[PDB]
Design a protein around this ligand. Structure first.
Ligand SMILES: C=C(NCc1c(COP(=O)(O)O)cnc(C)c1O)C(=O)O
Ligand SMILES: C=C(NCc1c(COP(=O)(O)O)cnc(C)c1O)C(=O)O
Ligand SMILES: O=P(O)(O)OC[C@@H](O)CO
Ligand SMILES: O=P(O)(O)OC[C@@H](O)CO
Ligand SMILES: [Cs+]
Ligand SMILES: [Cs+]
Ligand SMILES: [Cs+]
Ligand SMILES: [Cs+]
Ligand SMILES: [Cs+]
Lengths: 394, 263, 394, 263
């Protein structure tokens, strides 16, 4: 059995080859133990604060909401060491790795932010890190490939399939199945087999906890809605977690709409997929009628995945959280809007969240509403990508 | 009772079983069918067959490519079941085992999947990414449709797992040779083999990395009722894609050698 | 006359064409007034905290000092919004610009960090920003050129002279002399004509103030020495300022040694130059026997300037602060060391400071000493530059 | 008293003064010397000369390039002083004013610089990046060596500045036409001109942007004792670098036209 519930309703589980159950069981045990260990929590806190730079700021956007009744705040995970929220749970998983006596790290990465986070944590904590990254992403998120190498991490291009996140995930799992005795697989999102969705949420929940404290102190009340982009689901659940029991607070997850849902070229399995079993979990999948896992698409490598974390599938099922999609173009307009009017260059992943918020305001400009957008990361890694697109347009 | 009858006969002849593995539809439907008849004519005691899946996470490159090839030839799961029907129509007694990925089984309904397996004559089903911990609905559906649910006994198995596998399994017990994914180049148990027999687990077949006659004999000598070879077989398929004739010839040669080693 | 002392000993002054004195006088008056204005300080503080992300962390480096009696902390200005300490005083100068009713901003930039900071502040505060940048730097610090454009700033390549910082400075001044009525020149370092060296120090002193509070709380005492790289002198004086009256605290400025002082290809006028008059100030200059201002050199664009702020020239003169130099190679070894052993990618400018600290430890490994290195910025902007060099070496 | 004698004579002839500006050593020592003799023969009432400086922050492109050219020809400040000696040896009465950058003056010692100016026959010195606020040591050194310290009266000058410039200045007062840097393409005061005369400031010469006869007449008409033209002159030098002969011819033509406009 297991110490913790591997499911969120019907979603979740540990659908991995028998050979990996001991590793999963060991990880769960180590996590549960670490959660009751004062020394572990202190070491985690110390790293988050003095090394990563938490708490991150909560920035009010006065310019972009001008002339509307929308007040918009941005949780600045883009200011976290490394450039994205990814760094948070990586510091925790690295500590768990050491706790388990593992000396190596396996990680998958799409936007490269998790790769960079895994590399820096490994460099700091004395672990040998190897990162799988789809070849397409090696190109569209290149700044991060350089960062990873510079920090001593081995970056391994994956040319199989769509050569993106999904494929990097496949390789990471194959690798772990054959090296779990010495290597810890530092999964980068709230998905995969239990206990990862649980561990990743818990090691990212500080985002929402800080957001709540900061919003209360600045506004005297809770947000009408917190908005986050949803790839595998880590920054979103990290933001949502602490607000779940606050029923008045809207939880909005923004899945990539790619070139549009009707084109089939998107990464929105939650609202346009079908429940399936893949990557060690039973969750919504973009899949063919035959049961084959389809290839996803999104201008942002970080959201380019054909599935989603099981807790998001659950929260949507019971109606606690609402999920929507934002197309490439909508994300791009949000990206430019933030750059020019607030002086912040957001990651294209984060831009999807900001795009929905801007839609919510524009569509009903006289609706009074307090919104918080989780700015999961900065867009330095997306500069060249965005430039080339804006060039081909003028 | 195809597996029961095979192991009974094999036991009398005091030999182990050789079970080759191939992905259905690789490199194509017609050629795949011939490949399988050759495997049987060459000496295969039972079959282990895979159905092309978009993301075979328990497989290395060799079988990944096998799946890609089957996909290039437009091979679908439906066509795989038509093939299984034909194979069973030509070979009424050979035990047929499927190696599946969970989504393909879960897709149109778990029960419907095993109902189809029973309809085409399949004897067992091994779902690679479904550990005993998530097996309830699968093992139950299998038994309801007279399909033997196959469980893996990993080299890092503890006593509780040995016991679970022993009571839940039917047909045969898949004894993993090593950790990792499928692959002939990676070569990997007496104690585990003994414990299974103690708990009356279905006969054990060793798999993963078995690519030479020597490995076959070793498994049998160690107590295993037989061995399974996949990647080694599949490798002969891809190296002879240009000459189908030499492909079958090479396959027959190899299977005979592997089978003889089990005598 | 003036409200404040334009000199630091013999160094400083307002050596600009008569036409610009009113602008300088207006700026000084606005600064003095703003310093006594509670509302101005509150607005400045708000931006620094909620927008920039201050206070920045003070990270202890346990790995790189292993086996020595050196304790080393890094002031993480690399975590500041924008990626470098530059953002601090830019927020203050932007507020002064608005206070003076100016609607445009002129800024020079070498590493591009000041350019990016100027662009983001202008985007946030509603100012029209134009940036001068030497063409050579447009290339070796390109990531920042893209960032600036994306934020709506006009980047103007300067091909004159050495096509680097110095030249960008010249153009900025020429431009201001003809547009001071509508544009505020947001000088990016503690140099130039008074009141800039004073304003820039004051708007950067939070670095040292936070460093002192953080070091006291973590160590119970002051640092044996704070170390910072010195280009024009802003991050160094920003770090030094609050420690000046603490006589036990060593102040070490690290000038770029380029290819070595003996080669003449460096940016160390303070210890290898001669006092002169240029860029509106009387300060140490790298200059010919004839009195011509020489061209400087440094692998890091941010330190590539033939002069230095007047206060640094003064502090060195009275012996309060000691200045040394670090060559390109020494800076590079420090850059790699930090990346691989602490998981932080430092700006090449900051790497010079870290390099000296590492020397101080290595040369006398049994000497007990508490050191703080101002990690003025992150090195994302230096990744491609460093990669190409390390490639040509293996 | 070269400036005093010039303005006295000019006043009698009821005309304004035309003062051309060129950078010494551009495009070369020899050609620069001829260029200056032509300027004088063409009608120059006085001279305004620059010494090549690495960073001329008060100059636009035209004069920047003039400096670059002089540097290409290896022109140094020492050679500039040898030239000034020669120029003064050929023209004993023409007033000669230097337009300098502070570092060149401060370099080997402020007093030594003005001592050298006096030795070669220079009449005044204007240090472009030294406002009245930083002028003490410079104006003092100048007066000690019988050199007239020149001060700029900007268009944004207030009363306190008018008064300071009036009492500190000697020779002539440099009346700025506009803000910005030197440049012929950028064309830019009666009140300021009046205030200076009220405070008994040295005669005013207008400078910056003066590149046409019309502008010369306008300055004189407005009350200015004369005008200075630099970039317009320098532009003829660079456009005729290939034909030194046509260069001088073009220069003589232009200077005569500018001077006539001051009559
Ligand atoms: C898959 C990766 N990135 C995801 C990411 C996402 C999406 O993943 P989440 O796990 O849903 O939070 C959002 N924002 C930023 C800035 C990101 O980098 C990766 O870095 O490897
Ligand atoms: C000249 C510029 N950069 C300077 C700089 C320096 C040197 O300038 P200082 O003014 O001495 O602090 C140190 N560190 C970082 C990270 C820098 O970007 C510029 O960004 O335009
Ligand atoms: O490919 P193998 O030889 O590692 O065997 C494993 C499977 O392919 C057959 O179950
Ligand atoms: O070049 P001008 O015409 O702008 O005149 C300015 C100087 O060059 C002469 O003082
Ligand atoms: Cs912080
Ligand atoms: Cs608003
Ligand atoms: Cs997704
Ligand atoms: Cs130490
Ligand atoms: Cs310098």
């Amino acid at each position: 059995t297991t110490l913790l519930n591997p499911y969120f309703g019907e979603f979740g589980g540990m659908y991995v080859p028998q050979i990996l159950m001991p590793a999963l069981n060991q990880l769960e045990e180590a996590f549960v133990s670490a959660q009751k260990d004062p020394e572990f929590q202190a070491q985690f806190a110390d790293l988050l604060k003095n090394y990563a730079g938490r708490p991150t700021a909560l920035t009010k956007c006065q310019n972009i909401t001008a002339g509307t009744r929308t007040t918009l705040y941005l949780k600045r995970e883009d200011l976290l060491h490394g450039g994205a929220h990814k760094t948070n749970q990586v510091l925790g998983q690295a500590l768990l790795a050491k706790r388990m006596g593992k000396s190596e790290i396996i990680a998958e990465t799409g936007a490269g932010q998790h790769g960079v986070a895994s590399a820096l944590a490994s460099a700091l904590l004395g672990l040998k890190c190897r990162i799988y990254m789809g070849a397409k992403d090696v190109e569209r998120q290149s700044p991060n490939v350089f960062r990873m190498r510079l920090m001593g991490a081995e970056v391994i291009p994956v040319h199989s399939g769509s050569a993106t996140l999904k494929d990097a995930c496949n390789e990471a799992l194959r690798d772990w199945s054959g090296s779990y005795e010495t290597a810890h697989y530092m999964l980068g999102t709230a998905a995969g087999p239990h206990p990862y969705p649980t561990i990743v949420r818990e090691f990212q929940r500080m985002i929402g906890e800080e957001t709540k404290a900061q919003i209360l102190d600045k506004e005297g009340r809770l947000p009408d809605a917190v908005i986050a982009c949803v790839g595998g689901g880590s920054n979103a659940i990290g933001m949502f977690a602490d607000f779940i029991n606050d029923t008045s607070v809207g939880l909005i997850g923004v899945e990539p709409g790619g070139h549009g849902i009707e084109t089939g070229e998107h990464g929105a399995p939650l609202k346009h997929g079908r429940v399936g079993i893949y990557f060690g979990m039973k969750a919504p999948m973009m899949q063919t009628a035959d049961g084959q896992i389809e290839e996803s698409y999104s201008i942002s490598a970080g959201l380019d995945f054909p599935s989603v974390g099981p807790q998001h599938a659950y929260l949507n099922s019971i109606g606690r959280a609402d999920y929507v999609s934002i197309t490439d173009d909508e994300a791009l307009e949000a990206f430019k809007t933030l750059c020019r009017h607030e002086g912040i260059i957001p990651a294209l992943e984060s831009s999807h969240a900001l795009a929905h918020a801007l839609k919510m305001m524009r569509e009903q400009p006289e609706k009074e509403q307090l919104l918080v957008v989780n700015l999961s990361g900065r867009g330095d890694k997306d500069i060249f990508t965005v430039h080339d697109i804006l060039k081909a347009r003028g | 009772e195809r597996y029961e009858n095979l192991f009974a006969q094999l036991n009398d002849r005091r030999e182990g079983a050789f079970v080759p593995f191939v992905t259905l539809g690789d490199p194509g439907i017609e050629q795949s069918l011939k490949i399988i008849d050759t495997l049987i004519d060459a000496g295969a005691d039972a079959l282990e067959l895979g159905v092309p899946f978009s993301d075979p996470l328990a497989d290395g490159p060799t079988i990944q490519n096998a799946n890609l090839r089957a996909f290039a030839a437009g091979v679908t799961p439906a066509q795989c079941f038509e093939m299984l029907a034909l194979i069973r129509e030509k070979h009424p007694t050979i035990p047929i085992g499927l190696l599946m990925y969970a989504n393909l089984v879960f897709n149109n309904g778990i029960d419907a999947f095993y109902a189809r397996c029973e309809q085409v004559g399949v004897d067992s089903v091994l779902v690679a990414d479904v550990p005993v911990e998530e097996s309830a609905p699968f093992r139950q559906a299998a038994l309801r449709h007279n399909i033997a649910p196959i469980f893996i006994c990993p080299p890092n198995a503890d006593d509780d797992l040995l016991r679970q596998v022993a009571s839940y399994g039917r047909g045969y017990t898949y004894l993993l040779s090593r950790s990792g994914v499928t692959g002939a180049e990676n070569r990997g148990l007496h104690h585990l083999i003994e414990k299974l027999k103690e708990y009356h687990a279905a006969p054990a077949l060793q798999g993963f990395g078995i690519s030479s006659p020597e490995q076959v004999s070793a498994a049998v000598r160690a107590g295993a009722a037989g061995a399974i070879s996949g990647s080694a077989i599949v490798k002969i398929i891809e190296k002879n894609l240009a000459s189908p004739k030499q492909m079958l010839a090479e396959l027959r040669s190899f299977v005979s050698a592997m089978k003889a080693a089990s005598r």
